[PDB]
Symmetry: C3
Subunit: 314 residues, 3 copies
């Protein structure tokens, strides 16, 4: 099967600045040429060009509503499209808000897909519950069925069609959940493994459950939405939402690693990688590199080593 | 139920200097206002005022005997008192030596209480076995029944009445135990989980045993004596007794976290936080903040998120 | 039983420079006097003197072939010798290439021995498969039976006699395996626990399997070849082959710790400790000290404390 890399230099989900420089920093780090070396075929679709909706008045709290809406509309399209041609979609963020289009597009071509969301946050706050109007913290809401109608209609997000239900998604990493967000997830009984779960079970066990829970019955495609801030800041320091006590490098890789072995990786999102947010070059480097790492992991690089089939190295 | 915060700016247990600035650095870090936001009621009883016994000759090895004795006498009083009025006692150290009064006072109002001691050390060295005469390393001894008489009588500690037996306490973190201390704990068969145990079992399992072991039969109150140096120096760098390979942040929180869920937290001690001991402001900050973290954890903040009951955020 | 410390200031296995200063930095750090304090007898055999074979032309890729061959010939001798007199052999590297002689000598006196290899690498690349000709990355190959003949004959390694088979060795730590190396290990079905395994199982479980796998049937001696780079660079920073996401300090100790408890430690190798490779004195210090740590662990120091038998400290 083939891979399709899609840039998503967007940053209006987050109030900060620099995440759009994400895909570029990733590419820069050799992400493609590297992916190239795996047993997958690679094509760099480039970075979507985003048209900034002039005069994007805040729809209440929600800021840059239309700017984001249109942004995601394009992406969901490009994604859906390449998904249609059976290529696995890899989106390079850009902030997590772009998630909406990535999943939406995907859903179209693969509606039975499930979602593995790795992040310190749920990003499931609704236009109402957000304490900011930052959409990079409301992705799961627009995509969620159960949350349909449960909030007004934001300008530009008219095209979104809740494409998944709480029994289709699993969180991993959570450690900073807003009262609303918590309520919402505890109410809709959404399966997750906050750091406490992980601490109690061990990444290993966590994956097992995560997998049998989302794939026990039907073996549907898997959409991995990996928020860089999900790993402790000690590995993914360059982000806008750093939270202490998060997934270790090793844990993070184990996840991407196990998900590779499932052979069901259909869609991937590498988000919140914000180059400008680095106390030192190192940090920014460190981040990106693990970012790249995770990515290759998802695609077969194994901590246990790799060799080319049908080839006697002796 | 309500909370009672009691400062314990003491430092004569340790030979170093700066721990008395502990409670202040904690307070400073927003510890109260933060605690305030939990579903507990809060009252800051202030920082006991300690009278330095002029001319405190070393009772043999034991240094600043009377200075400490009187220090703890006051605390055990204030503690006992507020415990009586059913408020959960939170002591901010100050060095671990102050533990004696914190537990003693507590014992009075709740003698059936058990103790969860988190620390890299046992601090169970007797006036005889200590290699220094530093009392901040002899707390468990004065409080221990089994060790009653097993050593001379120190000036000022005349008031102490061994209030617990080796089947009432559990250590977690141990990784630097003196030959004596070891002997003593292995002799009196005291239950513990040194880092090796934790490595073998996983904080999760460790808590399970820790809980069924100390609460299997009777569901007594729980006295948590948390020594900041119990976490790897990578989180709690600002202390006088740093030891490598200790509880991670995540582990440390899991503990306080589980103990919160038991609903039996009766007494707490936040010790050895020594502001002056920081290679950089960061370290000192980092420490304090996790210190605060642990504390709030004990009181309901959950890595998995928090929302207010009977409130539709929608 | 007694201990025999043998220096191996060698560095021609690695292209870098400084590892020969290893044993010295270790000694310097109190390694002996420390070991002395354990319930083992200690004798410092000194650091073998190595004669640099003048004009060591690269046998193809393999560099410094003869220089290394002769180096290991001496060691295998000294090792074999002291092993004969029933003393447990402790070799202080020096680069991992010296492993060949350490194991070889050992094998002679204890051919039924098994090997626990802790390292980020397999160092099982053959003169053919190496991408460099650096022998410090080919140890396991020369010692392996299955790999006998599977490659030309290197100058100076004429004396080596494949002394163990893939069912006698277990890797722990692996996270950087060359395509060849991988192939070779997956082909010969060699048991190992790469970081992914460890992440999935937990050092604890890993040791269990490691032990029942290598000692289930016969309780043979154990040869521990510990490559310093096996721990995350965050503890063992001073090495030529640092790899991210490796064994933690705690994990590393747990291993040496469990292996101590088996009572079967027959041979040990403390390698790749390269003093010159330190961004700061600290790093170099940090490394060495954990190096020493591991070592003492293997010999009875327990995170859970230590006391002298038949002695009432009361
Ligand atoms: Mn996110
Ligand atoms: Mn996030
Ligand atoms: Mn203490
Ligand atoms: Mn301590
Ligand atoms: Mn090696
Ligand atoms: Mn290595």
């Amino acid at each position: 099967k083939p891979i399709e890399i899609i840039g998503a230099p967007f940053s209006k989900g987050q109030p900060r600045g620099g995440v759009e420089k994400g895909p570029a920093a990733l590419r820069k780090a050799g992400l493609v040429e590297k992916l190239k070396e795996t047993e997958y075929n690679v094509r760099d679709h480039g970075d979507l060009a985003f048209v900034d909706v002039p005069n994007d008045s805040p729809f209440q709290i929600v800021k840059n509503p239309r700017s984001v809406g249109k942004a995601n509309e394009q992406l969901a399209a490009v994604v859906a499209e390449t998904q249609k041609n059976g290529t696995i979609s890899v989106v390079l963020g850009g902030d997590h808000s772009m998630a909406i289009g990535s999943i939406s597009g995907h859903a179209r071509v693969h509606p039975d897909l499930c979602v593995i969301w790795v992040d310190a946050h749920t990003d499931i706050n609704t236009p109402l519950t957000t304490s900011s109007g930052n959409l990079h913290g409301q992705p799961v809401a627009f995509l969620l069925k159960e949350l349909k109608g449960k909030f007004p209609d934001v300008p530009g997000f008219s095209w979104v069609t809740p494409c998944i239900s709480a029994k289709d998604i699993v969180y991993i990493g959570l450690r900073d959940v807003d009262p609303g967000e918590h309520y919402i997830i505890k109410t809709l009984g959404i399966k997750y493994f906050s750091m406490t779960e992980v601490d109690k079970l061990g990444i290993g066990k966590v994956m097992e459950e995560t997998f049998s829970y989302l794939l026990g019955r039907k073996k549907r495609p898997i959409h991995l939405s990996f928020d860089v801030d999900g790993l402790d800041p000690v590995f993914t320091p360059a982000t806008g939402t750093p939270v202490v006590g998060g997934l270790s490098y090793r844990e993070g890789l184990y996840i991407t690693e196990e998900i590779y072995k499932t052979g069901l990786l259909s869609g991937l999102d590498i988000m919140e990688v914000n180059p400008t947010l680095g106390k030192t070059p190192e940090e920014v480097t460190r981040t990106v590199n693990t970012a790249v790492a995770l990515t290759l992991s998802c695609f077969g690089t194994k901590k246990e080593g790799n060799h080319k089939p049908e080839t006697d190295y002796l």
